[PDB]
Amino acid sequence: VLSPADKTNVKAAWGKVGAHAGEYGAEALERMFLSFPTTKTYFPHFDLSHGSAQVKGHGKKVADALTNAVAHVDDMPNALSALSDLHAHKLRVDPVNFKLLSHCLLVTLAAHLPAEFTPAVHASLDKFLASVSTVLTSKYR
């Protein structure tokens, strides 16, 4: 459950990311694959080399949904349902990883948003990512 202050911080920090969404999306993925090897078992069909067209491509798509979750932050469960159905019936990605990607996303945003990544924003962004993940695993069983 995000608060008015949470949503303010989120829309604020993410709104700043702007046109760097895709790019930052690819970085979090590159940060996650190197920091948490095990996460690569879900991308056996991917070329994971630095800057692979696959990763860059999967990076945008990720950030796009997040960009969308932000626009409907008061109705994410419905804005992410098609994506949630996906991760539950097809990809079936084990829940424990979401937290892993979420960390890497924070880390990525921390490096790029030095002015806005304040303790408050950071905290709020953690609740957002955690809130999104919970939605993506909401239909796992």
Binding site: T41, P44, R92, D94, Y140
Partner: protein, 146 residues
């Protein structure tokens, strides 16, 4: 968190009364019922649409057996599980692409089975030991990942 002599000679004695075949199939079975998504690695096993379909599924029974087999053979290298499964970890990572969490979950289902079978015989002190075991097995199996 290594096992104490008394714990090692407790794991043994209990395991000696275990029907690896049935428990391996019961464990891997329940694993695809309680945590649905783990069914992603077994698309070719056929029908899994329900609890009885998976539990009664031959290919599942069989794999449950093979799997506990390696595990069963493991309770003998309780001082170097890390060395026993190096080639299986190296394997589950490179070819099968299995997320190590599954090793943790299965172990979780295992403890519930072993409890389901022995009942009051499966003592808190014994569970603790097996937790260590299962936890240990999970780790070595993940150790060689990269």
């Amino acid at each position: 968190v290594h096992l104490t002599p008394e714990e090692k000679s407790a794991v043994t004695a209990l395991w000696g009364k275990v029907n690896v075949d049935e428990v391996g199939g019961e464990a891997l079975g329940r694993l695809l019922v309680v945590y649905p998504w783990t069914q992603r690695f077994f698309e070719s096993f056929g029908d899994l649409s329900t609890p009885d379909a998976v539990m009664g599924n031959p290919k599942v029974k069989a794999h449950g057996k093979k799997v506990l087999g390696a595990f069963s053979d493991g309770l003998a290298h309780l001082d170097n599980l890390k060395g026993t499964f190096a080639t299986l970890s190296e394997l589950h990572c490179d070819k099968l692409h299995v997320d190590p969490e599954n090793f943790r979950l299965l172990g979780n289902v295992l403890v519930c089975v072993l409890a389901h079978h022995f009942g009051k015989e499966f003592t808190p002190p014994v569970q603790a030991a097996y937790q260590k075991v299962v936890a240990g097995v999970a780790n070595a199996l993940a150790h060689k990942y990269h």
